[PDB]
């Protein structure tokens, strides 16, 4: 049944979440329904909007976990993190800090 929502609908799932939680839109074939989660699922990051908290799909190139739309926190293996984006090699101007995968100056 309707875990985490203050209001729920048989057709649309959750409409508002208890205020801790994140609103996630689950796609199941033709259906799209709302769920309220403690944390966003893999591949998704959370956004605390003015109205509600919600999950959105990470689409940063060569990222394994997004903070926000344009800021990757964990790049995928072999790419260096540079100002929220993931590169095969650091860009000129920066090198990796010692044994790690962060570009620095």
């Amino acid at each position: 049944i309707c875990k985490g929502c203050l209001s729920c609908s048989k057709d649309n799932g959750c409409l508002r979440c208890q205020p801790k939680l994140f609103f996630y839109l689950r796609r199941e074939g033709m259906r799209q329904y709302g769920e309220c989660l403690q944390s966003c699922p893999p591949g998704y990051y959370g956004v605390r909007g003015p109205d509600m908290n919600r999950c959105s799909r990470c689409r940063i190139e060569n990222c394994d976990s997004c903070f926000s739309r344009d800021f990757c926190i964990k790049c995928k293996s072999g790419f260096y993190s540079h100002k929220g984006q993931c590169f095969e090699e650091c860009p000129e101007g920066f090198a990796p800090l010692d044994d790690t995968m962060v570009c620095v100056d």
Binding site: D11, N12, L15, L25, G29, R31, Q32
Partner: protein, 161 residues
Amino acid sequence: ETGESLAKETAFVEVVLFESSPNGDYKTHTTELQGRFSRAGATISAEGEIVQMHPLGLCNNNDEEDLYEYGWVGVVKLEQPEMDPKPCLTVLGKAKRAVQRGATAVIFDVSDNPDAVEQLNQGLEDPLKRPVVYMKGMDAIKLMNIVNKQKGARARIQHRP
């Protein structure tokens, strides 16, 4: 002083459930529903696979969205107005956004938000080129039952001239 508006034309919506059968053929079963064409969109026939959209997901705010195949018929079940106290978009806005995301047409179930009908029909904004249909009562119940329970379905929205 203005008089009553012309009635909105009937949208004869055939919902098709389909099943592949022994050879590669399809066995189909049709449900006939009726709504109305709103002033928010053109009064024309349209057809496409049915895709439910949660009303709260139709926003400009959330930006990169998943790519759906072009030409789907959006089904949006509207909730009681107070459930969305400051909408990201008006009902016309949401219909537009669905068309931007590749909708060939949009059907609103307005059973829980009768006021949406006045909004769709205001006719102050310039209409979409695709049909924006509203449905309620048993028609809407039957539509949502199919969406909730079937694996897939195709809507054929017919303007019967």
